[PDB]
């Protein structure tokens, strides 16, 4: 009829790929995050902000390449190409670490475009939208560790860089400064992740193992009609199996796949809440009771009071080369030595 | 008729509720022994010299430890790899000082879980299934035996095994990173890909099946009453789910076969865990991780720094502080 | 209509009973050490 | 010092949702 009708005819025409009303967001706003990450890992140094030569052009490998965060003096600016820190000088903008703030803040909309494309195809093909609500949890994770954590903590410098050997630095950063280990929200997170990894293997090694009899040869993959009104695995038999080995066992394969949906997103949301609580420096650091008891009684020495005395050894050694903008050079007497280990 | 025949018929019956079988006669009493020692030793164990340097370590709830910090202390290093049961000790106030219950619980728990894997074979054979559940259960068995048996054999002491507690697990992990650099090791990255892919594939399959449930109930009651138990009707439109996935990403990354999809779910995280199970066993024998110290060098000969040259500083900081009262000679921990 | 035409019944089976009680006690076991500090 | 507030919080977080689930379970299993 009018405008917004032929533009709905196209963008919903079917081809090999599927561009849509939010594909018009997803395909342009992403793919530059991928190009910017590849560009920063390959061509672009990090000599000026950090003090680390981390490019393919500077001899690094696939493990040790990372698009690096800006310096601490670029406190919380968005670091545009134009503007008050680079003035459009593209070489200086790449030198000042603007590529990380390009890729992160540009792919934050890539996640929105992907979840809306996942939401739009589920309306086109008339299905229930449970595939959309699961992908909200890695969006919560991405926002929690790359967006909310550097905002309230004096710098984009205190953010995990886009790499492989830089994520490791971020993990040891939390392990030696925040003690992210003792966070019950992180206990929820590892329970969700590792239980989902459990239940995937359980269901996969159960369903094709209590399988029916349709073919002739032992290659049981060739005996499946995709257009089938029968079953392909004996639910009664697997119920009796896991009931007699393990005790409780499922009986409702609606609830089974819904539980597989529900476990890892619960883990990742309950990790995101703790990453927020760590962003505000409400860390799960030392207690009251064992510390006031261990200051009084010398020979106490729990693994807790060894982990604290080890994390101090992390934080006093790694800082003087991790963050040079502090401008501190520890003498060797100040460092936790251990009496000649 | 005969006593042995009636006893074998009872023990290989399938009508008693928790199945036993013939591996069950080692699975059941040995794990009950391990549980009954662990519950006592988590509550009321006296402090244990983990180091052999005359420094006892509190691990139980009664001596000022909560649920997180509570742990069963591993055996002292002077005890070494020597088998140290109760009857070789002097008293029970002398067995508990030198790392008593860890030596008992670990050697019980391993024999428990291997026979549990045999039981998972046996009940499948007794019902008439296909027998490959135990092959998938071989992965966490390997992951348990690598940290409880293989690594203390490699280090030559039962001290460096994993302490049986929450706050002790992390003190195992961090010192393992210090001495072995587990993150810069390609088996461990394969295992990280295994667990993350397992979570992804579980959430993805549980989304794409729940998104195609056939309407059989109303919208006031539960959406789980649409599946009556023991039917023959496929409650999820797998054709429509596969069409949705093919429109979503790819038509040549199809996996249209439900059986191929289930093989992929069974073989991604199991093979993911097997490579870390090999990786711990290789790092047990001092075959180390990677090492990129002082790699990036300028044209003169001076040393530049990378993220590897920051992880080196963090591992130095861990290494010069772990086991603070023992090490005198400058290496070999 | 003076009596409510939307009086409806809640329903909670034994499986959900065990899940809820296990969730509450596992949450208690986890957070209790940090609460008591 | 132990959290005398904390033990009351522990006991309340035990008893309140437990009773909440028991009411619904007994109402459910009453009919069937």
């Amino acid at each position: 009829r009018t405008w917004f009708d032929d533009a709905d005819d196209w963008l919903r025409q079917d081809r090999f790929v599927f561009v849509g009303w939010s594909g018009l967001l997803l395909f342009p706003c992403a793919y530059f995050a991928l190009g910017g990450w590849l560009t920063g890992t390959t061509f672009v140094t990090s000599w000026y902000t950090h003090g680390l030569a981390t490019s393919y052009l500077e001899g690094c490998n696939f493990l040790t390449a990372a698009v690096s965060t800006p310096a601490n003096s670029m406190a919380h600016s968005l670091l545009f190409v134009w503007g008050p820190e680079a003035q459009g000088d593209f070489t200086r903008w790449c030198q000042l670490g603007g590529l990380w703030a390009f890729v992160a803040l540009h792919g934050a909309f890539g996640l929105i475009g992907f979840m809306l494309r996942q939401f739009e195809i589920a309306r086109s093909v008339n299905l229930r939208p449970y595939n959309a609500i699961a992908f909200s949890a890695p969006i919560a994770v991405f926002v929690s560790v790359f967006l909310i954590y550097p905002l309230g903590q004096s710098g984009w410098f205190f953010a995990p860089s886009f790499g492989v050997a830089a994520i490791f630095r971020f993990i040891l950063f939390f392990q030696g400064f925040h003690n992210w280990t003792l966070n019950p929200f992180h206990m929820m997170g590892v329970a969700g992740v590792l239980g989902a990894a459990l239940l995937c293997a359980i269901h996969g090694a159960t369903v094709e193992n209590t399988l029916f009899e349709d073919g002739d040869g032992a290659n049981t993959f060739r005996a499946f009609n995709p257009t089938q009104a029968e079953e392909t695995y004996s639910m009664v038999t697997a119920n009796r199996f896991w009931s007699q080995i393990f005790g409780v066992a499922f009986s409702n394969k609606r609830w089974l796949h819904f539980f597989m949906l529900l476990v890892p997103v619960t883990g990742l949301w309950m990790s995101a809440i703790g990453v927020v609580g760590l962003a505000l420096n409400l860390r799960a650091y030392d207690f009251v009771s064992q510390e006031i008891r261990a200051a009084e009684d010398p020979e106490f020495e729990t693994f807790y009071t060894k982990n604290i005395l080890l994390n101090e050894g992390i934080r006093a050694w790694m800082a003087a080369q991790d963050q040079p903008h502090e401008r501190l050079v520890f003498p060797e007497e100040v460092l936790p030595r251990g009496n000649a280990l | 008729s005969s006593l042995w025949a009636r006893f074998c018929e009872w023990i290989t019956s399938t009508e008693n509720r928790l199945y036993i079988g013939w591996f069950g006669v080692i699975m059941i009493p040995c794990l009950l022994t391990a549980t009954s020692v662990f519950i006592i030793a988590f509550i009321a164990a006296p402090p244990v010299d983990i180091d052999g340097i005359r420094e006892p370590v509190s691990g139980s709830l009664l001596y000022g430890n909560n649920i997180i910090t509570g742990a069963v202390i591993p055996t002292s290093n002077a005890i070494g790899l020597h088998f140290y049961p109760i009857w070789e000790a002097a008293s029970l106030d002398e067995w508990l000082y030198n790392g008593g219950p860890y030596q008992l619980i670990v050697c019980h728990f391993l024999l428990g879980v291997y026979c549990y894997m045999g039981r998972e074979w046996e009940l499948s054979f007794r019902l008439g299934m296909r027998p490959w559940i135990a092959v998938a259960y071989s992965a966490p068995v390997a992951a348990a035996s690598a940290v409880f048996l293989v690594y203390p054999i490699g280090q030559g002491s039962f001290s460096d095994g994993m302490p049986l507690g929450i706050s002790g697990t992390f003190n195992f992990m961090i010192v393992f990173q210090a001495e072995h650099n587990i993150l810069m090791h390609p088996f461990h990255m394969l295992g990280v890909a295994g667990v993350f892919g397992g979570s992804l594939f579980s959430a993805m399959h549980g989304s794409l099946v729940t998104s195609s449930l056939i309407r059989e109930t109303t919208e006031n009651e539960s959406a789980n009453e649409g599946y009556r138990f023991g039917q023959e009707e496929e409650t999820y439109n797998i054709v429509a789910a596969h069409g949705y996935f093919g429109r979503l990403i790819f038509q040549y990354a199809s996996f249209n076969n439900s059986r191929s999809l289930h093989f992929f779910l069974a073989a991604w995280p199991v093979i993911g865990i097997w490579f870390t199970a090999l990786g711990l066993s290789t790092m047990a024998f001092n075959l180390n991780g990677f090492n990129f110290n002082q790699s990036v060098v300028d044209s003169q000969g001076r040393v530049l720094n990378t993220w590897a040259d920051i992880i080196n500083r963090a591992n130095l900081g861990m290494e010069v502080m772990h086991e603070r009262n023992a090490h005198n000679f400058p290496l070999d921990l | 209509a003076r009596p409510n035409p939307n009086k409806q019944v809640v329903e909670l089976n034994r499986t959900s009973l065990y899940w809820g009680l296990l969730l509450i006690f596992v949450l208690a076991v986890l957070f209790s050490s940090y609460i008591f500090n | 010092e132990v959290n005398i507030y904390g033990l009351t919080a522990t006991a309340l977080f035990i008893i309140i949702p437990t009773s909440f689930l028991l009411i619904l379970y007994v109402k459910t299993a009453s009919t069937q």
């Binding site: 005790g247 | 649920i67 023991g230 | 065990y18 | 522990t10």
Partner: peptide, 30 residues
């Protein structure tokens, strides 16, 4: 004092495990 709370919570979790294993609803047929 709090050790009794810890022990009560662990024993209650194990008790719910016990009742979940043995006193479940029977998964019944057609």
């Amino acid at each position: 004092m709090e050790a009794l709370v810890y022990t009560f919570l662990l024993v209650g979790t194990l008790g719910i495990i016990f009742f979940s294993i043995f006193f479940r609803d029977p998964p019944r047929m057609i």
